[PDB]
């Protein structure tokens, strides 16, 4: 009998493909192929960045790169991702602070709402 190639492909991706290529159960990770090789920003990298803000200061991403990500992480991209995970285009008022996880989500929601009521919410960041 003929077989369905969707389930076969999911099963093959489960045990053969890397964790960066396949998602959850068996689905394909499209963000991996929407980005050139070597710059994917894995969820492990995102959690490492969140732990870096949790532990050390914000805006001091030199020791963060040195002893938190791999010893080799893309500066400027770290600033971009920290901008994206606060809902604000700039980190000028957050330099030198050590924002916790709950405060991070609270300030992200506050920035999103503040850009919402003043009409600055352009791809969930606030321009100032």
């Amino acid at each position: 009998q003929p077989l369905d190639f969707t389930q076969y492909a999911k099963n093959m991706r489960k045990d053969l493909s890397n964790q960066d290529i396949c998602l959850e159960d068996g689905a394909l990770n499209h963000s991996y192929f929407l980005t050139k090789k070597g710059q994917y920003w894995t969820p492990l990298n995102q959690k490492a960045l969140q732990r870096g803000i949790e532990l050390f200061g914000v805006g001091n991403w030199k020791e963060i790169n040195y002893d938190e990500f791999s010893g080799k992480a893309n500066i400027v991209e770290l600033e971009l991702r920290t901008c994206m995970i606060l809902g604000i285009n700039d980190i000028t008022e957050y330099y030198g602070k050590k924002i916790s996880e709950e405060e991070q989500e609270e300030i992200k929601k506050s920035n999103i709402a503040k850009g919402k009521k003043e009409n600055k919410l352009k791809d969930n960041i606030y321009q100032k």
């Binding site: 050139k36 710059q39 893309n74 400027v76 991209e77 971009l80």
Partner: protein, 32 residues
């Protein structure tokens, strides 16, 4: 020089790294 940045084949992240490196060198000359 903006010509290296001006290339279309580059992505938005390497372009932005180039812009920041240009800022670093020209702010070094501004300090000079």
């Amino acid at each position: 020089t903006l010509e290296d940045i001006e290339n279309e084949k580059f992505t938005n992240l390497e372009i932005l790294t180039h812009l920041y490196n240009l800022k670093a060198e020209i702010v070094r000359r501004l300090a000079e």
